[PDB]
Design a protein around this nucleic acid. Structure first.
Length: 549
RNA sequence: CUUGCUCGGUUCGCCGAGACUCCCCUACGU
DNA sequence: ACGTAGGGGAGAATTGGCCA
DNA sequence: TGGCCAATTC
């Protein structure tokens, strides 16, 4: 049963007035600011808004929240059921911990009676059936400098005769590039794509955004959403690309049926200018599972092999010099036991490893350029303290132990952590009986083994408290300037993309090596966190079982 | 495989390789 | 040591009052 | 009749 609905984002080409000034947005803001600032008794009393016109009108009558002229029942139910659920999300977040305590109780209501942690305003316009997107029609819709395609006529492709375009014209592939072109079904980029003109280290081209914008606008696929007397006009080529890369639609489809793979209830965020569409329940035939927790794997694979008589595995072994050391296998079903035959183990290829090691030199090179400039901008009283702490214990503890009078040359190098040589060199200058001791818990229930301290324990005790004076300057200004640089939010997405690239390569090699469409991924009981998250996400985004053995 | 996004090449005329589960919200935990 | 946790979202078939 | 489009409910 298909139960996953991945998103598809489209751009906005025109709009009557900014989305923040629409009556629906103002009503949503008013309702949210009213609901978030009321107590539990007021929530129980003011919780009879219902799903009827006679009930919504009565609610807006007694509460007195401005209605801003918006009186649509379909679009108001979405606003009010979300807003009260957001309010009743503080209670259950705390109440989840309340039952953890049972397995002074925490309360989400403060002394004033209102929520201490109250939710912010959601800046979204959730569309409904009555404002569903429709193909742009110049006669029936406001006039725009755009061409509306025939809803039933076949949508055009890009440039069919790519090699026949003459010289001196857009899209002309030069002769010397002809011998080595691509042969796979590659996504076709038009000549006005910003990716082909973006500023680069050595691109040596001139980006005239005006001509690219005009050329892109002359060949758009306009669709229109009207709410009340307002409207927005979007570009549907994002939906076309979404249905093309997934293979669910072959070229030669119309605009009436292109919108037919997506739900007619988009979501609009005014700050960016993007409409987020969603596939219907069945467009992408993906059943979203969750990773298996051990003993359920020996039941999952039995049923998986009960359908396909040959299933392929992959043993993702994180934590080596190569991040992904895959180990393939194939399983057969005889009885209650599964029989496997290894096929071989590969490592992640060098080119992808090169991309990883060139990204890893872009994050450690920004965690310096951000953290250092966050440190330099502390107040002088905090800045001097943190600077002193940074250089603290470098030679301070060495000077202290020399003041103690021990021989400061035996533990010179590597400290021989196996033999806890700190205690040895304390014993050297007659400090054997002043050696501080540590308790051990070797016993199953308890244990009193207060004995010579280990080297790690010595390091813990000899080093000072470091930066506990503030703990809210270095740990706060850095995390505040993290969002002040767009490079960080770009690098997080780059890390996720690289992790997904590695996962995709491993999955396709598992399919190829095992010669089976049904495959499974097993993970045992840096890039480690992002790779584990990416490998676990296949059960939720693509349906491939993931096992934590 | 027409928009948008990420990483490379160049003769600058564009083409080689990627991701496609995403949004707000409140705190500071492991 | 660096991002993380946990709350909230992401329809549409049917029906009715309904003027031209 | 019937066409249009908010309102009613799962």
């Amino acid at each position: 049963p298909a139960n996953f609905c991945p998103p598809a984002k489209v751009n906005i080409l025109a709009q009557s007035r900014p989305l923040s000034e629409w009556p629906i947005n103002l009503v949503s803001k008013g309702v949210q600011e009213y609901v978030y600032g009321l107590t539990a008794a007021e929530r129980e009393a003011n919780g009879d808004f219902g799903t009827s016109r006679k009930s919504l009108d009565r609610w807006f009558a007694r509460t007195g929240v401005p209605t801003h002229g918006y009186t649509t029942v379909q679009g108001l139910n979405l606003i009010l059921r979300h807003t009260f659920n957001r309010y009743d999300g503080v209670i259950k977040k705390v109440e989840t911990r309340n039952e953890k305590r049972r397995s002074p109780e925490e309360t989400a209501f403060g002394p004033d009676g209102k929520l201490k942690e109250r939710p912010g305003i959601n800046p979204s316009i959730y569309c409904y059936q009555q404002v569903s997107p429709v193909p742009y029609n110049p006669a029936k819709h406001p006039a725009l400098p755009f061409s509306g395609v025939d809803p039933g006529a076949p949508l055009p492709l890009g440039t069919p005769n790519r090699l026949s375009i003459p010289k001196g014209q857009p899209g002309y592939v030069p002769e010397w590039q002809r011998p080595h072109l691509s042969t796979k079904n590659k996504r076709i980029r038009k000549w006005y794509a910003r990716a082909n003109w973006r500023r680069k280290p050595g691109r040596k081209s001139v980006l005239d955004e005006a001509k690219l914008k005009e050329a892109a606008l002359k060949e758009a696929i306009p669709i229109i959403v009207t709410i009340g007397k307002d409207w927005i006009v979007m570009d549907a080529r994002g939906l076309l690309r979404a249905v093309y890369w997934r293979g669910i639609a072959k070229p030669g489809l119309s605009l009436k049926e292109l919108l037919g793979f997506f739900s007619g209830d988009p979501v609009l965020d005014p700050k960016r200018g993007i409409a987020t569409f969603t596939f219907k329940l069945g467009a992408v035939a993906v059943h979203s599972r969750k990773p298996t927790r051990g003993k359920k794997s020996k039941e999952l694979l039995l049923s998986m092999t009960a359908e396909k008589p040959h299933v392929g595995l992959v043993a993702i072994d994180l934590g080596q010099t190569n991040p992904v050391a895959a180990e393939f296998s194939r399983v057969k079903r005889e009885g209650e036991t599964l029989q496997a035959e290894p096929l071989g183990q590969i490592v992640l290829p060098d080119d992808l490893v090169k991309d990883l090691t060139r990204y890893r030199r872009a994050w450690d090179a920004t965690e310096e350029q951000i953290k250092a400039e966050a440190i330099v901008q502390l107040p002088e009283e905090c800045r001097a303290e943190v600077v002193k702490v940074n250089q603290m214990s470098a030679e301070e503890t060495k000077h202290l132990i020399l003041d103690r009078g021990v021989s400061g040359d035996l533990p010179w190098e590597k400290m021989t952590s196996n033999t806890t040589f700190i205690s040895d060199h304390l014993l050297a200058k007659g400090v054997t009986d002043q050696v501080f001791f540590e308790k051990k818990s070797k016993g199953k229930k308890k244990g009193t083994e207060t004995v010579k301290r280990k080297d790690y324990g010595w390091v813990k005790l000899l080093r000072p408290r470091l930066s506990q004076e503030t703990r809210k300057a270095v740990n706060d200004k850095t995390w505040e300037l993290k969002r002040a640089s767009t490079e960080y939010v770009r690098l997080s997405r780059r890390k996720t993309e690289l992790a997904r690239r590695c996962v995709n390569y491993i999955v396709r090699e598992t399919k190829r090596w095992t010669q089976c469409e049904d495959i499974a991924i097993v993970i045992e009981d840096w890039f480690i966190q992002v790779l584990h998250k990416a490998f676990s996400d296949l059960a939720l985004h693509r349906g491939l079982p993931v096992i934590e053995a």
